[PDB]
From a paper:
The recent identification of SmbA, an effector protein from Caulobacter crescentus that is jointly targeted by both signaling molecules, has opened up studies on how these global bacterial networks interact. C-di-GMP and (p)ppGpp compete for the same SmbA binding site, with a dimer of c-di-GMP inducing a conformational change that involves loop 7 of the protein that leads to downstream signaling. SmbA stimulates Caulobacter growth on glucose while preventing surface attachment in its active state repressed by binding of the c-di-GMP dimer. The major conformational changes promoting SmbA’s functional switch affect the C-terminal helix 9 and the flexible loop 7 containing c-di-GMP subsite residues R211 and D214 from the RxxD motif.
To understand how a flexible loop 7 influences the overall SmbA structure and its ligand binding, we present here the high-resolution structure of a loop 7 deletion mutant (fragment 198–215, hereafter SmbA∆loop). In addition to the SmbA∆loop/c-di-GMP complex, we also determined a crystal structure of the protein in the absence of c-di-GMP. The Crystal contains four molecules in the asymmetric unit. Overall, apo SmbA∆loop shows virtually the same structure as in complex with c-di-GMP with an rmsd value of 0.49 Å for 225 Cα atoms. Importantly, in the SmbA∆loop mutant, C-terminal helix 9 adopts an outward orientation similar to that found in the ppGpp-bound active state of the protein. For completeness, the affinity of ppGpp to the SmbA mutant was also measured and was found to be virtually identical to the affinity of the compound to SmbAw31t indicating that loop 7, as expected, does not contribute to ppGpp binding.
Residue numbers in the entry:
A (entry chain B), B (entry chain C), C (entry chain D), D (entry chain A): 1 to 197, 216 to 307
The structure:
């Protein structure tokens, strides 16, 4: 395992971040063992994306097995950010601080409100948690452009964004600009469904025809080469998956794979212009006034 | 103006769809004048993205200035789709039906719920609207991969998705696969903030240095050549912007521009691997048991 | 080994043509050994490009070890083709016919005279050889564009031209147009010195860093995939090199190597405009009379 | 016009060199007029590539219209360089020196002998010319790789080599390496027949469809951006072509044209493997011993 600085927090994070999300088949000791396995593969960054009592119990017990400062703990808070408030923060206190037995969270990762501001009572509660050292930073998850007025908020220290080997320059520019402005960036969706379909049929078929590599491992290896990502979020629900993903961190992508990734970006298909409808255009032109 | 079939449900839609969104500057007469200009430039497809009374009043007057069957009217319903319920349908009746003075909507465009299903009471209410012809289709707006179980819902006839000249193959595959499966696709974000920033400095600087073309117009022309999009959503708050955008529909992109769009996709800035931290990895390995 | 049609002649040749070129350290035994190894690897096409007695002796012996009609034997005749004459025909009779113990040549491959015509006496000598059934065809070797009036000569059935994985479209167009116009095309210089230097430092370094492939074998494998070439000329001076080159005919290039070959074609270096010399230019413009 | 250092010689040459080649359809005053037009457009570098009495008379008269030391005059000596001898020197003295009325040549440009050495008597004669200050340098023209032992000869200060926008990296490496080793490099064949054909149909069609530019001028523009070339050789036979080519030296190629040039390098077409002939292969393998 390799380790990167998390933005300007001064905390080193493993190249992979393990997301823990509700799975009703899992009981508490499964969650504890999942985290134990991640720790044994050098993963110190965890993202809690669920709040079932068994998840909190097992995860909290595993986190307690190492000294707190060795871990980076993010709570993922979904829902319409514009509708968050004091009841949200009460729930966060029950789940994150009682459920996981934490004194502080490193990062609260919320949805992009698509606004320059947060609701007042929620932001005031966040400020309270920050001054109490119970919350060390706020992050914004987005699949588009986050309002710079929101990123300028003193609470906001991190962003989360998708990035994969078929991302274009808009997505790449978002992560690189955020990193150059000293935000920590968490990469998401290194292996999205659309790319799994492309890997089977078409220009990306090399992803399933490269000796010694799976398509998923190639997509992870590529995201791991991107300078602007502090860490790449992965989800794994058994030991074998954690071990394989962590193994990718120490491998080198073949240069021929890199060239095929670049080759594959080309796009040719164009459209002939669509039909004229002068009758329709004329009726619209002659609207009543 | 040119017109495209909207998915498998027949209707002709202008290659541009005009998004009408809350702007506290504009009163009802300004909204009416804006829709009038749109109509006069051949636009018959409008997406209402807001519920301010002045907006509903002016847009509804303007829509009534032509025969209803010439227009394709989409209501954009934001917010967490998992929290939609009967109150949502009440508010829709007041705003979209009474407020715009409509008997039916061509499309209700909701956020991706990131689930294969919608809340049951809301879905039951939508089924009621559909059986009465008050709602002709449901669309799902997403910046990721929509669950196929949701797309298989009989209500769902359309998807909306970002596409621009810096989009990669994941985004492109989503819209081509949707189209091939006979969904109507509305293109979004042809001119996102990230691309505006790239157009000023770097490999996309040609966007602001092409004789006879603005960067925005190049980005629109490119979107208009994508075969899978039924229509391209644009936001324009004055007559000049509407006229310029509609003029793009009839122009041909220079071949040197298309070549530069393809050459700009390349990306070569690839990390050196991060730090080992063997003390940290060992401490994590040696967690208590 | 695979066998291709040699242009429109109606005869077949091995995908490789072994060139035998003067080498002062080799004796007849050594030349015979080389030809034997090539025969044992399916090569039936040989190009004699030297006239040292030991070369003619050893090669003639080896050719006499199989039925003459199973071989395609090309004599390479260098020198200014505009200076060829009766002395040339006399020397050809000593070296090619008496020296190799041949009754006929499959091809006489001369330099491009950079003209539409051949010297009269030389051409009459070639017509005499063809009427005597001692010469089946004339070929023209060039590194530029051959005069089409020369190619229209009834004697000329074949051309020889460079092609390698760093060739561009002018080179490629020449060989494809010759093949489409029913000439046999012999590929030369699949592994020129300049590419051996590129293979060591720069964008072509992958040629020496591809698992299981040597740089020379990749360059031959690429030339073997060009559709316009009837055969690829190779030079080898030891058994083991002949066996490896022949083995490439049955191998498949990795798709990642093909991608790197395409990626390597890009060139971005540009110079700034040079110095103005207004006084020098004014002096030149003010020339007398 | 712009002027570049001619390798490490210490002298400057115009960025274009005008080649004057034998043309039976021109008379002395036509040649004089071509040289005059070149001079009036800043060209001071001329290559004489023929020896017709009318060519020598007209070109010599035009060269005498300016101070000799302002011109760079190259005599192009074709023929098999391995056959050069005393006759060649006598002919050079009669044609280049007496026929052009010159006391010295700035450069003698011979064909690549394809050897590390020149014939002794010829080389001794060149040494006599140099000691007499009648010859300032020897250049070697090649379409392949010149033996480094020949380039190391103290006489040889320049090379001439093809370079166009469809050239590959082997050609480009040759010229950049020569320039880095302090040779003057003359660029040849900026506009070869093969490229004229590609410009008419195919991926290079943009060469004849670019507003404001001819195909020829784009090809010359690209060659003028190559850093390793001291000058680009052109052959023009009318006033207006000379003026347009000189004008290219002061123009900037559009970035869209540059992108298309890089686009066009791609080559996709491949060959399936040819026929097996197991009986022929077996017959060759069982050659007699």
């Amino acid at each position: 395992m390799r380790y990167r600085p998390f933005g300007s927090t001064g905390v080193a994070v493993s190249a992979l971040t393990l997301r823990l999300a509700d799975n009703p088949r899992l009981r508490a000791n499964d969650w504890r063992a999942l985290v134990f396995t991640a720790l044994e593969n050098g993963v110190n960054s965890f993202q809690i994306d669920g709040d079932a009592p068994e998840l909190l119990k097992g995860a909290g017990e595993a986190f307690a097995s190492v000294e707190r400062h060795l871990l980076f703990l993010t709570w993922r808070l979904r829902g319409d950010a514009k509708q968050l408030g004091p009841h949200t923060l009460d729930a966060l206190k029950r789940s994150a601080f009682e459920g996981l037995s934490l004194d502080y969270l490193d990062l609260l990762l919320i949805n992009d409100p698509q606004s320059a501001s947060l609701p007042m009572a929620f932001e005031s509660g966040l400020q309270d948690l920050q001054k109490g050292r119970a919350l060390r930073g706020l992050g914004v998850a987005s699949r588009g452009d986050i309002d710079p007025g929101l990123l300028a908020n003193d609470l906001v220290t991190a962003v989360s964004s998708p990035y994969n080997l078929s991302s274009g320059w808009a997505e790449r520019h978002r992560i690189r600009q955020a990193s150059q402005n000293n935000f920590a960036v968490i990469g998401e969706d290194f292996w999205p469904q659309a790319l799994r379909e492309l890997a089977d049929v078409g220009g990306y078929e090399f992803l399933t025809n490269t000796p010694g590599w799976s398509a998923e491992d190639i997509c992870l290896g590529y995201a791991l080469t991107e300078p602007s990502l502090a860490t790449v979020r992965v989800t794994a629900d058994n030991r074998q998956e954690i071990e394989r993903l962590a193994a990718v961190v120490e491998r080198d992508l073949p240069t021929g794979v890199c060239a095929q990734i670049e080759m594959a970006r080309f796009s040719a298909q164009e459209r002939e212009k669509a039909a004229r409808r002068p009758k329709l255009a004329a009726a619209l032109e002659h609207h009543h006034h």
